[PDB]
Structure formats: C-alpha cells, structure tokens
C-alpha cells in the first residue's frame, strides 16, 4: 500500500506515535516519506546481508528476523515479513521498540538526514486527526 501523508498520520496517531517519547507526529510521517515514500512494501537489500523493510525501513540486523542477516538480534520479536504488511501495526510497534531501546529517531537515516531540524509539523498540516 502507498499511504497518503494524512492517512498515515491518522494511522500513526491511532497507534500512539504522536509525541511518543518526545517525537511529535510529523517526525514519524516525515521519516516514512523519506525512508519509503509511504510504501508499505519498500525493501532495500544491503550488501552487509541485512535488509531494510517496510514503510519505516527497519533493518534486519537488530530489529526483525529474516534469517539471512548476520548478527541478528530480532529485538522487535517479529519476522521482517510483518514489516511489509499493508496495516502498519508491526512497523509502528517495532519503531516504538527502537526508541524504547534508547535509540532516538537518529536511528532512521532519512529522518536524520532529511527531517531533523525542519518544520516537521508541515507533514501533518491540514490532516484530519
């Protein structure tokens, strides 16, 4: 599925991301925009043997299990396939875990390199929430 910004914002808010651990909702929408262009099936296969999965491009070394990644920790306790669902449950819960494990949103390269410091609230402007 390819979300719209406002549709994604609303779903992320239903899943408890707005201001979660100090990250206003637009941060999460911005991260998704630049990680995956809002595509729930986005998949980036890296040369280290890990892969980034789903709308938030969560990586298979620390976070999800794909059985092909060296050093796997599966800290989200999910198959990476769950991160490719059209519903965002697993991706949001795993995103929450990433931050609960002490990583900021700096964990998402696209957030760091594109969203941080900007007017991220623009991503939710005009949306019904």
GROMACS .gro file of C-alpha atoms in nm:
model
  129
    1UNK     CA    1   0.000   0.000   0.000
    2UNK     CA    2   0.122   0.350  -0.059
    3UNK     CA    3  -0.017   0.580   0.205
    4UNK     CA    4  -0.105   0.940   0.179
    5UNK     CA    5   0.057   1.172   0.433
    6UNK     CA    6  -0.267   1.245   0.619
    7UNK     CA    7  -0.387   0.885   0.611
    8UNK     CA    8  -0.056   0.777   0.750
    9UNK     CA    9  -0.061   1.049   1.013
   10UNK     CA   10  -0.400   0.933   1.132
   11UNK     CA   11  -0.298   0.570   1.144
   12UNK     CA   12   0.023   0.654   1.327
   13UNK     CA   13  -0.173   0.861   1.577
   14UNK     CA   14  -0.419   0.576   1.636
   15UNK     CA   15  -0.113   0.364   1.706
   16UNK     CA   16   0.014   0.611   1.967
   17UNK     CA   17   0.301   0.786   1.784
   18UNK     CA   18   0.202   1.147   1.834
   19UNK     CA   19   0.460   1.279   2.079
   20UNK     CA   20   0.579   0.927   2.160
   21UNK     CA   21   0.900   0.958   2.351
   22UNK     CA   22   0.926   1.319   2.258
   23UNK     CA   23   0.868   1.283   1.884
   24UNK     CA   24   0.570   1.480   1.753
   25UNK     CA   25   0.366   1.306   1.485
   26UNK     CA   26   0.515   1.490   1.190
   27UNK     CA   27   0.855   1.342   1.267
   28UNK     CA   28   0.718   0.993   1.205
   29UNK     CA   29   0.537   1.092   0.887
   30UNK     CA   30   0.848   1.271   0.759
   31UNK     CA   31   1.058   0.967   0.836
   32UNK     CA   32   0.821   0.744   0.642
   33UNK     CA   33   0.811   0.986   0.349
   34UNK     CA   34   1.185   0.978   0.301
   35UNK     CA   35   1.251   0.621   0.408
   36UNK     CA   36   0.992   0.456   0.184
   37UNK     CA   37   0.785   0.720   0.006
   38UNK     CA   38   0.498   0.584   0.218
   39UNK     CA   39   0.519   0.240   0.056
   40UNK     CA   40   0.448  -0.041   0.298
   41UNK     CA   41   0.630  -0.289   0.074
   42UNK     CA   42   0.951  -0.095   0.032
   43UNK     CA   43   1.252  -0.319   0.069
   44UNK     CA   44   1.620  -0.220   0.046
   45UNK     CA   45   1.861  -0.511   0.041
   46UNK     CA   46   2.203  -0.412   0.169
   47UNK     CA   47   2.547  -0.557   0.093
   48UNK     CA   48   2.612  -0.641   0.463
   49UNK     CA   49   2.348  -0.906   0.434
   50UNK     CA   50   2.085  -0.703   0.612
   51UNK     CA   51   1.771  -0.562   0.463
   52UNK     CA   52   1.553  -0.264   0.544
   53UNK     CA   53   1.185  -0.341   0.544
   54UNK     CA   54   0.861  -0.157   0.509
   55UNK     CA   55   0.728   0.192   0.547
   56UNK     CA   56   0.992   0.280   0.809
   57UNK     CA   57   1.274   0.079   0.652
   58UNK     CA   58   1.353  -0.111   0.969
   59UNK     CA   59   1.670  -0.318   0.950
   60UNK     CA   60   1.707  -0.690   0.989
   61UNK     CA   61   2.030  -0.691   1.191
   62UNK     CA   62   1.897  -0.559   1.520
   63UNK     CA   63   1.524  -0.537   1.475
   64UNK     CA   64   1.340  -0.808   1.278
   65UNK     CA   65   1.424  -1.160   1.176
   66UNK     CA   66   1.471  -1.251   0.812
   67UNK     CA   67   1.707  -1.547   0.875
   68UNK     CA   68   1.968  -1.424   0.637
   69UNK     CA   69   2.123  -1.145   0.834
   70UNK     CA   70   2.445  -1.189   1.032
   71UNK     CA   71   2.440  -1.078   1.390
   72UNK     CA   72   2.062  -1.092   1.420
   73UNK     CA   73   1.909  -0.974   1.743
   74UNK     CA   74   1.541  -0.962   1.649
   75UNK     CA   75   1.473  -0.708   1.917
   76UNK     CA   76   1.123  -0.639   1.786
   77UNK     CA   77   1.048  -1.013   1.807
   78UNK     CA   78   0.892  -1.025   1.463
   79UNK     CA   79   0.955  -1.167   1.123
   80UNK     CA   80   1.063  -0.898   0.883
   81UNK     CA   81   0.765  -1.002   0.669
   82UNK     CA   82   0.540  -0.840   0.931
   83UNK     CA   83   0.702  -0.508   0.840
   84UNK     CA   84   0.570  -0.546   0.483
   85UNK     CA   85   0.204  -0.559   0.581
   86UNK     CA   86  -0.041  -0.307   0.447
   87UNK     CA   87  -0.154  -0.238   0.802
   88UNK     CA   88   0.118  -0.058   0.997
   89UNK     CA   89   0.090  -0.247   1.332
   90UNK     CA   90   0.418  -0.425   1.327
   91UNK     CA   91   0.612  -0.130   1.188
   92UNK     CA   92   0.476   0.108   1.449
   93UNK     CA   93   0.531  -0.134   1.736
   94UNK     CA   94   0.884  -0.201   1.621
   95UNK     CA   95   0.950   0.171   1.576
   96UNK     CA   96   0.838   0.216   1.935
   97UNK     CA   97   1.078  -0.058   2.043
   98UNK     CA   98   1.367   0.108   1.858
   99UNK     CA   99   1.314   0.420   2.065
  100UNK     CA  100   1.238   0.224   2.382
  101UNK     CA  101   1.581   0.064   2.338
  102UNK     CA  102   1.741   0.404   2.366
  103UNK     CA  103   1.784   0.497   2.006
  104UNK     CA  104   1.640   0.828   1.905
  105UNK     CA  105   1.488   0.885   1.569
  106UNK     CA  106   1.851   0.925   1.470
  107UNK     CA  107   1.819   0.551   1.406
  108UNK     CA  108   1.639   0.637   1.084
  109UNK     CA  109   1.894   0.777   0.842
  110UNK     CA  110   1.631   0.950   0.643
  111UNK     CA  111   1.491   1.120   0.948
  112UNK     CA  112   1.841   1.233   1.050
  113UNK     CA  113   1.935   1.348   0.703
  114UNK     CA  114   1.622   1.499   0.585
  115UNK     CA  115   1.368   1.561   0.874
  116UNK     CA  116   1.571   1.667   1.179
  117UNK     CA  117   1.564   2.041   1.234
  118UNK     CA  118   1.293   2.110   0.978
  119UNK     CA  119   0.932   2.215   1.026
  120UNK     CA  120   0.816   1.856   1.050
  121UNK     CA  121   0.471   1.959   1.155
  122UNK     CA  122   0.415   2.053   0.795
  123UNK     CA  123   0.377   1.681   0.726
  124UNK     CA  124   0.057   1.672   0.932
  125UNK     CA  125  -0.077   2.014   0.839
  126UNK     CA  126  -0.426   2.007   0.703
  127UNK     CA  127  -0.484   1.650   0.809
  128UNK     CA  128  -0.787   1.521   0.997
  129UNK     CA  129  -0.661   1.357   1.319
   0.00000   0.00000   0.00000
